[PDB]
Design an enzyme around this catalytic site. Structure first.
Site, PDB file in Angstrom:
ATOM      1  N   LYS A   1      38.084  40.105  28.774  1.00 16.79           N
ATOM      2  CA  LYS A   1      38.997  39.230  28.045  1.00 16.79           C
ATOM      3  C   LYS A   1      38.541  39.013  26.598  1.00 16.79           C
ATOM      4  O   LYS A   1      39.367  38.880  25.697  1.00 16.79           O
ATOM      5  CB  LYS A   1      39.286  37.926  28.813  1.00 16.79           C
ATOM      6  CG  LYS A   1      38.098  37.264  29.479  1.00 16.79           C
ATOM      7  CD  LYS A   1      38.549  36.158  30.429  1.00 16.79           C
ATOM      8  CE  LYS A   1      37.359  35.503  31.126  1.00 16.79           C
ATOM      9  NZ  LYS A   1      36.554  36.461  31.944  1.00 16.79           N
ATOM     10  N   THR A   2      37.236  39.008  26.360  1.00 16.58           N
ATOM     11  CA  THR A   2      36.749  38.893  24.997  1.00 16.58           C
ATOM     12  C   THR A   2      37.140  40.179  24.282  1.00 16.58           C
ATOM     13  O   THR A   2      37.459  40.174  23.086  1.00 16.58           O
ATOM     14  CB  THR A   2      35.227  38.734  24.924  1.00 16.58           C
ATOM     15  OG1 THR A   2      34.836  37.535  25.601  1.00 16.58           O
ATOM     16  CG2 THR A   2      34.768  38.661  23.470  1.00 16.58           C
TER      17      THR A   2
ATOM     18  N   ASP B   1      36.431  30.379  23.830  1.00 16.03           N
ATOM     19  CA  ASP B   1      36.024  30.800  25.161  1.00 16.03           C
ATOM     20  C   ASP B   1      35.652  29.567  25.973  1.00 16.03           C
ATOM     21  O   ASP B   1      35.288  28.537  25.407  1.00 16.03           O
ATOM     22  CB  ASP B   1      34.832  31.760  25.062  1.00 16.03           C
ATOM     23  CG  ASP B   1      34.524  32.465  26.376  1.00 16.03           C
ATOM     24  OD1 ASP B   1      33.437  33.075  26.473  1.00 16.03           O
ATOM     25  OD2 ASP B   1      35.357  32.419  27.306  1.00 16.03           O
TER      26      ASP B   1
ATOM     27  N   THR C   1      37.394  31.207  32.719  1.00 11.98           N
ATOM     28  CA  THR C   1      37.049  31.843  33.977  1.00 11.98           C
ATOM     29  C   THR C   1      37.398  30.872  35.106  1.00 11.98           C
ATOM     30  O   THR C   1      37.200  31.174  36.280  1.00 11.98           O
ATOM     31  CB  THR C   1      35.541  32.172  34.041  1.00 11.98           C
ATOM     32  OG1 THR C   1      34.780  30.980  33.817  1.00 11.98           O
ATOM     33  CG2 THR C   1      35.156  33.203  32.989  1.00 11.98           C
TER      34      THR C   1
ATOM     35  N   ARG D   1      31.218  44.959  33.247  1.00  8.17           N
ATOM     36  CA  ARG D   1      29.900  44.531  32.772  1.00  8.17           C
ATOM     37  C   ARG D   1      28.779  44.940  33.714  1.00  8.17           C
ATOM     38  O   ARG D   1      27.753  45.441  33.261  1.00  8.17           O
ATOM     39  CB  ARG D   1      29.867  43.028  32.545  1.00  8.17           C
ATOM     40  CG  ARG D   1      28.513  42.502  32.112  1.00  8.17           C
ATOM     41  CD  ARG D   1      28.605  41.020  31.861  1.00  8.17           C
ATOM     42  NE  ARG D   1      29.439  40.731  30.697  1.00  8.17           N
ATOM     43  CZ  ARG D   1      29.953  39.538  30.412  1.00  8.17           C
ATOM     44  NH1 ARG D   1      29.759  38.510  31.233  1.00  8.17           N
ATOM     45  NH2 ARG D   1      30.690  39.380  29.319  1.00  8.17           N
TER      46      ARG D   1
HETATM   47  N1  LIG Z   1      39.217  47.359  30.063  1.00  6.00           N
HETATM   48  C1  LIG Z   1      37.987  47.723  29.644  1.00  6.00           C
HETATM   49  N2  LIG Z   1      37.747  48.977  29.210  1.00  6.00           N
HETATM   50  C2  LIG Z   1      36.525  49.336  28.796  1.00  6.00           C
HETATM   51  N3  LIG Z   1      35.511  48.463  28.802  1.00  6.00           N
HETATM   52  C3  LIG Z   1      35.707  47.191  29.227  1.00  6.00           C
HETATM   53  C4  LIG Z   1      36.959  46.801  29.657  1.00  6.00           C
HETATM   54  N4  LIG Z   1      36.883  45.508  30.021  1.00  6.00           N
HETATM   55  C5  LIG Z   1      35.611  45.102  29.817  1.00  6.00           C
HETATM   56  N5  LIG Z   1      34.905  46.132  29.336  1.00  6.00           N
HETATM   57  C6  LIG Z   1      33.472  46.110  28.984  1.00  6.00           C
HETATM   58  O1  LIG Z   1      32.745  45.222  29.838  1.00  6.00           O
HETATM   59  C7  LIG Z   1      31.924  44.336  29.070  1.00  6.00           C
HETATM   60  C8  LIG Z   1      32.385  42.895  29.275  1.00  6.00           C
HETATM   61  O2  LIG Z   1      33.585  42.671  28.544  1.00  6.00           O
HETATM   62  P1  LIG Z   1      33.984  41.220  27.989  1.00  6.00           P
HETATM   63  O3  LIG Z   1      35.220  41.399  27.144  1.00  6.00           O
HETATM   64  O4  LIG Z   1      32.757  40.597  27.369  1.00  6.00           O
HETATM   65  O5  LIG Z   1      34.366  40.421  29.334  1.00  6.00           O
HETATM   66  P2  LIG Z   1      34.634  38.826  29.373  1.00  6.00           P
HETATM   67  O6  LIG Z   1      35.247  38.502  28.040  1.00  6.00           O
HETATM   68  O7  LIG Z   1      35.562  38.669  30.557  1.00  6.00           O
HETATM   69  O8  LIG Z   1      33.275  38.203  29.576  1.00  6.00           O
HETATM   70  C9  LIG Z   1      32.036  44.773  27.616  1.00  6.00           C
HETATM   71  O9  LIG Z   1      30.900  45.556  27.233  1.00  6.00           O
HETATM   72  C10 LIG Z   1      33.294  45.611  27.566  1.00  6.00           C
HETATM   73  O10 LIG Z   1      33.163  46.713  26.673  1.00  6.00           O
END
Ligand SMILES: Nc1ncnc2c1ncn2[C@@H]1O[C@H](COP(=O)(O)OP(=O)(O)O)[C@@H](O)[C@H]1O
Ligand SMILES: Nc1ncnc2c1ncn2[C@@H]1O[C@H](COP(=O)(O)OP(=O)(O)O)[C@@H](O)[C@H]1O
Lengths: 301, 283
Positions: A46-47, A91, A131, A190
């Protein structure tokens, strides 16, 4: 080293299809997008989406977290320092104090916010990430024009994510290697990206650039990564329901048994289990599907 | 907005017209008012309309923004006999600040206090009984929302077909804010197809793409209805319902049932709740 655009964004087909429509509209309308809300388990991307949207909208992005804000004015100040068109990403937005949350409503809805008042507002796009959707108030979520709930990833989707990420690390992750890491990544980019960096290390010490399935397994087993990707909590939850017979258990009981918050069960522990078809939320409680019984038996062989 | 072409809240409008008339007839400002009801039904809108009818200023604030004394004392001091003070989430006040409010409302610079709360059963009798007027906003009928949507659509330079407005109405949980929000998402699907006329087809495409429930139900609304329907109309009490859904009672009556009652999905009887005939027809 995360995707920079939709050009090759893996998974979340549904969210991507919709964002593409709203993005075209806003630009066609020569305006910025309405407020967006992303919700779903940690590490699902989501980030990432938030920053992709900044790129697609050729707009700058400013990031912060709910707990990071405390003084009501602080937030008002943050708004004051935003150029018309910018994006404000908050966030853990569900952890905002009612006071701050009360100052935000008018900012989102109207773009305006001794004795004194005044203060207009540039006109921006607020992106919120949580979350804990269940902890989010109606007055707050109902003010986001767009609401999206990220889903977990298929193993085939993770595979692709690993293959592309591996490439950036100067490594070739064979398909079978990608599938095996994904299998233990609990459908979460992740975790999979974390395990990738570990498999790589074994490759490096062996002067290898091609991560094979055999070596992937070597690393994974050597680290004792659960073969099915379960947490200690996943096992405890399935064992609690599986222990009970095909008779539904309600949060009241479950939460009591696992000495855990009632909300943490719905928005953190269950999402993955429901996604992989391990449990179901019946009319009067929860029950474990065939997957669970056979999965647990398999885990303890 | 000012009651001229106001849609919905028939009874509140009817009663207000009388009190506003009587009040002005005796050169006085309205007594204290309490608006109750789920978020997004129009409490703030009504408060503004009153401000216009009485042609008086209106100052907005909330319980959480009033931390300790000094805050409240300052707001009342900067009033003007006849002004209107709108306090949101009023049931969120502490007994201390709540204690400082009882007198000002009754002892006094004659003014009008408008309290808003989404939890009537959460508010205490002592305070509730001091608001001369009490109104529980009600959910809107499909036809009412449809008309509201159509009007917003015009302001968004687009014609919204009746069937398209109803469809959105249907999935907007009888709530103006949600309805309006969904309208903007449908506007976008229209833009992408260079359409000025929002048709039902286009509406469904949008609502379905976004994954909005067909009847605007939550995960709760479904379990609750599955629980009552399974009961083949044998009345069930709250205690039972509260346990089955692992939900607090006030949330059931104060937040979940209100909408289900409004749309005739369930009924309140002396012996308990029952799923209505209407819910046995739809799935
Ligand atoms: N749809 C996606 N395609 C490629 N990589 C992703 C995807 N979603 C998440 N990631 C990878 O997983 C990791 C976590 O993503 P993040 O956006 O920080 O998740 P959240 O915001 O839910 O904590 C990052 O390194 C990101 O590059
Ligand atoms: N009777 C109505 N007619 C048209 N729109 C309404 C009506 N009531 C509420 N709305 C709309 O719904 C939204 C909710 O307004 P508000 O008064 O803030 O609701 P609440 O204060 O109860 O959350 C506003 O955008 C308003 O335009």
């Amino acid at each position: 080293l995360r995707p920079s655009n939709f050009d090759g964004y893996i998974g979340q087909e549904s969210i991507k299809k919709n964002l593409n429509v709203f993005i075209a509209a806003a630009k066609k309308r020569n305006e910025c997008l309405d407020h967006i809300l992303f919700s779903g388990p940690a590490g699902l991307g989501k980030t990432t989406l938030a920053n992709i949207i900044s790129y697609e909208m050729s707009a700058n992005i400013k990031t912060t977290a709910a707990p990071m804000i405390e003084k009501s004015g602080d937030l008002a100040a943050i708004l004051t320092n935003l150029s018309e068109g910018d994006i404000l990403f908050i966030d853990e937005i569900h952890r905002l104090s009612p006071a701050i949350e009360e100052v935000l409503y008018p900012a989102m809805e109207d773009y305006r916010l001794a004795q004194t008042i005044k203060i207009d507002l540039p006109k921006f796009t607020l992106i919120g990430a949580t979350t804990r959707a269940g902890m989010l108030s109606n007055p707050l979520r109902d003010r986001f024009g767009m609401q999206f709930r990220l889903e977990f990833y298929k193993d085939s989707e993770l595979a692709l994510i690993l293959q592309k990420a591996a490439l950036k690390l100067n490594k070739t992750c064979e398909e079978k290697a990608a599938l095996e890491i994904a299998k233990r990544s609990r459908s979460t980019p992740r975790i999979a990206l974390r395990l990738l960096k570990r498999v790589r290390d074994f490759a490096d010490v062996n002067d290898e650039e091609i991560i094979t399935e055999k070596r992937a397994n070597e690393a994974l087993n050597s680290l004792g990564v659960n073969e099915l990707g379960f947490d200690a909590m996943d096992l405890r939850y399935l064992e609690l329901l599986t222990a009970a017979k095909q008779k539904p258990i309600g949060l009241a009981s479950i939460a009591a048994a696992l000495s855990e918050d009632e909300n943490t069960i719905e928005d953190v522990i269950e999402p993955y289990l429901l996604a992989n078809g391990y449990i179901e939320r019946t009319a009067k409680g929860r029950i474990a599907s065939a997957k669970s019984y056979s999965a647990l038996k398999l885990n303890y062989e």
